[PDB]
Enzyme design. Structure first.
Site, short mmCIF file in Angstrom:
data_model
loop_
_atom_site.label_atom_id
_atom_site.label_comp_id
_atom_site.label_asym_id
_atom_site.label_seq_id
_atom_site.Cartn_x
_atom_site.Cartn_y
_atom_site.Cartn_z
N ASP A 150 0.84 -1.21 0.00
CA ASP A 150 0.00 0.00 0.00
C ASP A 150 0.87 1.26 0.00
OD1 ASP A 150 -2.35 1.52 0.13
OD2 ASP A 150 -2.90 0.83 2.14
N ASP B 197 -11.03 1.89 -2.56
CA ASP B 197 -11.42 1.75 -1.16
C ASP B 197 -12.93 1.77 -0.99
OD1 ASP B 197 -9.01 1.32 0.05
OD2 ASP B 197 -8.60 3.44 0.41
#
Lengths: 723, 723
Positions: B474, B544
């Protein structure tokens, strides 16, 4: 062609070319529309139950006629949408309840009583389905007639009514077809216009409600052509789904799309119900004209190419159906009316020297006809003006090497004519009302046998009097005060349709009596440019507007349905007339040579260099005429979408083509322009006259770099030939 | 593949799949763009002379660089359009004059120094052309690199600069490609978005001027994806010309279309010149990333299908390239940070019982990391929380039948970390300026070797400490105050690109060191979902935002370029988070099972019936996973065009398919809806689970009548199998 009925599924499957049209029997004899589109092997025939859509069968609340997609819907017993037909009974009720009774399938395609229709030359070319519907209570039978062609994506439809009961039935509405599409996600196209600007393409989104084109003029009209189409939102000239609906009829019409609350689109078309009724006594029948329905998933060009081939070869008839059409010159503006025999012959030598093939004699050869005012109806040669009659003039024209043709206008009569003084009741009129005039003339009542016999006799007397091989048949006004003193009150509203039936009988007789005559229909230009007229006269005067720029739109729109073989286009002299424009002799030639080519000017006013251009145009058109009149036509750029217009013609074997390009108001210092072609063999190389050799693939996928030019009107034409 | 040079015409013809890309040498060594489109056998290479377009050769006033269509244009010597590159010399001038020197053609496709690139597995798969350009005065060489694939309509392009002179050359702009189209009659498409709503499709007409998408974030970004396309005005998902431009790079980019006064469209793409320079000392070189250019005349689906196959099989790499990807569950929202070893294992048994294949351990396993605030950079296992380390947890998870995975965020460092206290100069920063934070963290300076070596060492220590077979990598902020204390002033503007080169080196090393690990890249969702990252990590966390309705748009747009195999999609728990929405477990499954499927919830909060649905979803996805991840993907209905979304997956042999349909805000008493399929064999019959048997032709040409339904969110999925 291949028409089947599956007794297990109760489904009719009509296979036409590469299209399928599918119907299915539903519950107690209702006939449902299932599918129409690209051919499928099979298609299986929800939510017919809807608030405020009532139930015709109280024992079965699963459906409404307000929701069932149908082939020939009625109003009054649960369908609230626009009906295909309506009948009033003696008791004043308008409720009718047709149910399926039986059907038959056979090879070939029937003739329609009293009417033009597409046809076959061999039974193998098509198959026909007749579905017999009936309302037992009232003895009303309606036979739905369907034909599927083998070779083309063509379904044709009509309906035949018959009173098999013992009471009078009044048809208030008798459309030729109706089809319920399952969605309304389409644009529609129709062809509105006016005199001097026929058949502009108009594409619009559908509304939830009704949209329609119609004519109330007793003629198909300049104002709306009897053609509409539904097209996919993204469809264009080259790709995408298109459904065309073309009415083979030359009188009043309605062409309508009604979209209902569930966004289904009902398309219907037929004789305009407005101001129309038809009385069926017991034992009497009524045949609707047909509607020719075409599907393509290859865009508008695919649809048009189908209509062109179908109409040129299986609608048009007679000795000239498949024959190159003569380059003609109309000798009007040489004289307006001002004529006598001495001029005409030398004129004919000049015209013959230029290579022109047909000499045409216009208005005012007859009676006292010398402005748009007189002697219409008196069809005897005014033997002052032509003392040696038509024969002497014609025979000399023939010895000069040109064919001889003539103008007639047989549907009109002048108040100041002998016919009118002997038979004033022979015009369309209503009791006690003023007789309104269009161009100082009245309309003859062709609903009457005596009138029609008189016209057949009189025109035949003229046509058999000389070696005439071309006739232009003109009609220069629309119907007012529609009625007939030969019909009873209860049939007065049949006048307009009976008139058209009468005209059809007259034209059928005239073209059969004179098989060596090429007939061209005309109505102030293209006022009756419709498939009905094409069945009788294999070409049509496209428009009175011969302005080059104006013709780009008129010809582009006309070609949506009609074959180029039928589309008269002439070079005329400038100052132009309807509009006011100056374009090069080259330019006007370019536009007119993209149709059925001819001339409309005074040859006595031409400069040597001009006649020299004309001599060259004539030679050029002779070289490409087969390609133009009989080749496959592709529209490339639309004058309805911008300042360019472009199209091309390709031979059957793709070895030859003719490309035409036009641009109006080309700006200074403009971007380079390109033209991508269509319809060529990508693996073949082609020589373009004056531009070198190109691959077919290069021409279609990369396109031609157009020679940069700028000016008010750019006009270019190229011949292509496989190397 | 088939790349040729014709010495007579001086034309380069690149044949890629069914496309042609053609260039030609012009006058004194200029390189012109000729054509790019459907394959042609040949295409021959006007009005280059234009007011105010000046002449580079005084002896030849036939052309300007302002009008010549080019492959790699410069500004300053007569072209006034947007240049592909620009170089500043020591004397301050920015004028450069590249001319053709030589070229070479070879089989296969080269690797690009320091960079990801599409590749071949066999030389026969592609051929490469290198065109060497040079400015002799300054010793600047630029090699234009072109590759044409055999099997796909793919041309790839990059440029390599080399200073062969004795002075410094500063590159101010170094785009990867530029192409001059002959018209601008196109729409463009690009993929703007934001966090939680990446890659919405935006289609717009071109303007006369410049339009562009770009990123200045040091990452390809959520805000603009590095992809643009030119599409024909009438092109759609299924038909029409489309030209795609996809940048294989994960940092700053510019993707631009500039239309000039002559309505030619210059498309260019590469590293964003904004805030960028690159200094080339004598003997130094600079390689641009590549741009992957795709042509289709089969609409957007044709283009996408090309990218999907190319990127899945010849861009993505490693052991899992062609392998079905595990159904995973992320165990974050089970605990946020709140965790220790006792829970995790029983959780793993529950998840294993449901059939889930991969157990993933999220943030806060390391150091003092317990909100979005701390310990980033200190990558040692916090052996309070996991006293038995990762090994004991992992091995138990494995004995339960699940693989074990881990989250890392190696590009970030917390101000409150040991790394930062030992090496504060290791972050990106500029002298004497505040260090701006994103989520309380700073960006590590990956332009530095010591930093990169430290990360490789540290992450390897963790990854080799346990049987880990999945890593989510990430990066949760964008670059500010971009600079490096390890670069001199004259190279400061190379920081962003050198950072990306550093990350690429790090990722290449990490994926090679751990070949049994499936790596998934992530950047607050799909903030670096680009082909550059795909070369290193074969799948990506798409967004997300896991809301079902929101994902319809995100997944639809992402699929324009990226293969479904790479497109992470997870079922999460509701109340949804970014948005606020409630959709059925069924519905969220339907959207997520149309991607690379997984879960993101707390299993401890599920009802038995819910786990039971999940058990069924898992079994279902396992059954269709090969079809979803590796089948041919067709978009059918666009959520950017209305309230519906629909798409389908078809097996290579067309014997199996999976169809998905969605509708939001379906109104009461609505019209019936239909769905036409694509990609099936029209002559095959298919069984649709729960709907019976249909012909492939019926399904595609008539379509499926959708079961009528109404409600806030309709969701349907069907398996099809040839009978």
């Amino acid at each position: 062609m291949a028409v089947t009925y599956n007794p297990q599924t109760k489904q009719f499957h009509l296979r036409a070319g590469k299209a399928s049209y599918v119907m299915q029997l539903f519950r107690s004899g209702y006939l449902a529309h299932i599918y129409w589109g690209k051919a499928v092997r099979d298609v299986r025939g929800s939510r017919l139950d809807r608030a405020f859509s009532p139930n015709p069968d109280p024992s079965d609340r699963t459906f409404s006629l307000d929701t069932l997609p149908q082939e020939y819907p009625a109003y009054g017993n649960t369908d609230f949408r626009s009906p295909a037909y309506q009948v009033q009974l003696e008791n004043g009720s308008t409720v009718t309840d047709l149910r399926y009774k039986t059907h038959r399938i056979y090879k070939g395609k029937p003739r329609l009583n009293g009417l033009p229709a597409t046809y076959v030359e061999h039974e193998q070319e098509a198959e026909t389905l007749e579905i017999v519907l009936g309302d037992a209570l009232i003895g009303l039978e309606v036979t739905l007639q369907y034909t599927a062609y083998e070779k083309w994506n063509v379904i044709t439809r009509a309906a035949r009514f018959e009173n098999k009961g013992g009471e009078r039935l009044k048809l208030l509405r008798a459309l030729s077809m109706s089809v319920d599409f399952p969605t309304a996600d389409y644009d529609w196209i129709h062809l509105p216009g006016a005199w001097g600007r026929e058949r502009w393409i108009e594409r619009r989104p559908l509304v939830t409600g009704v949209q329609a084109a119609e004519s109330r003029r007793g003629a198909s009209s300049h104002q709306q052509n009897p053609f509409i189409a539904l097209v996919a939102k993204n469809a264009d000239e080259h790709q995408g789904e298109v459904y065309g609906f073309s009415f083979v009829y030359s009188g009043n019409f309605l062409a309508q799309v009604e979209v209902d609350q569930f966004h289904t689109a009902r398309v219907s078309m037929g004789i305009n119900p407005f101001d129309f009724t038809w009385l069926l006594q017991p034992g009497e029948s009524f045949q609707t004209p047909e509607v020719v329905m075409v599907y393509s998933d290859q865009g508008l060009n695919g649809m048009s190419q189908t209509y062109h081939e179908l109409y040129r070869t299986r609608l048009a008839r007679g000795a000239f159906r498949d024959r190159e059409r003569p380059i003609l010159i109309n000798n009007w503006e040489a004289t307006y009316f001002d004529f006598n025999e001495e001029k005409l012959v030398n004129i004919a030598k000049t015209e013959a020297e230029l290579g022109i093939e047909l000499f045409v004699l216009d208005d005012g050869w007859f009676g006292k006809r010398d402005d748009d005012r007189r002697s219409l109806g008196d069809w005897i040669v005014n033997r002052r003006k032509l003392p040696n009659g038509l024969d002497g003039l014609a025979k000399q024209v023939n010895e000069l090497g040109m064919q001889f043709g003539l103008w007639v206008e047989p549907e009109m009569v002048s108040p100041n004519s002998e016919l009118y003084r002997k038979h004033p009741d022979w015009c369309l009129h209503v009791p006690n009302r003023p007789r309104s005039e269009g161009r100082n003339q009245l309309v003859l009542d062709y609903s009457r046998e005596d009138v029609c016999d008189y016209i057949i006799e009189t025109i035949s007397n003229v046509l058999a009097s000389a070696p005439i091989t071309y006739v232009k048949w003109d009609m220069n006004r629309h119907m007012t005060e529609i009625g007939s003193s030969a019909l009873p009150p209860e049939r007065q509203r049949e006048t307009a349709h009976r008139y058209m039936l009468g005209l059809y009988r007259v034209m059928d007789e005239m073209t059969s009596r004179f098989p060596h005559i090429l007939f061209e229909s005309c109505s102030g230009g293209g006022g009756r440019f419709d498939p009905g007229m094409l069945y009788y006269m294999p070409q049509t005067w496209t428009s009175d507007n011969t302005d080059a720029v104006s013709r780009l739109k008129i010809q582009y729109g006309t070609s949506l349905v009609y074959p180029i073989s039928a589309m008269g286009a002439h070079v005329s002299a400038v100052p132009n007339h309807q509009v006011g424009r100056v374009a090069s002799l080259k330019a006007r030639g370019h536009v007119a040579m993209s149709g059925n080519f001819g001339y409309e000017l005074d040859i006595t006013k031409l400069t040597e260099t001009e006649k020299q251009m004309i001599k060259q145009q004539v030679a050029f058109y002779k070289d490409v005429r087969r390609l133009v009149q009989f080749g496959t036509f592709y529209r490339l750029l639309s004058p309805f979408e911008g300042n360019e217009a472009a199209w091309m013609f390709v031979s059957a074997d793709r070895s030859e083509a003719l490309v035409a390009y036009f641009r109006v108001l080309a700006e200074a210092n403009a971007p380079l322009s390109y033209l991508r072609l269509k319809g060529l063999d990508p693996n073949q190389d082609y020589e373009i006259e004056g531009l070198g050799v190109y691959g077919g693939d290069e021409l279609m996928y990369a396109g031609v770099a157009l020679p940069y030019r700028s000016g008010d009107f750019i006009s270019m034409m190229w011949r292509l030939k496989a190397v």
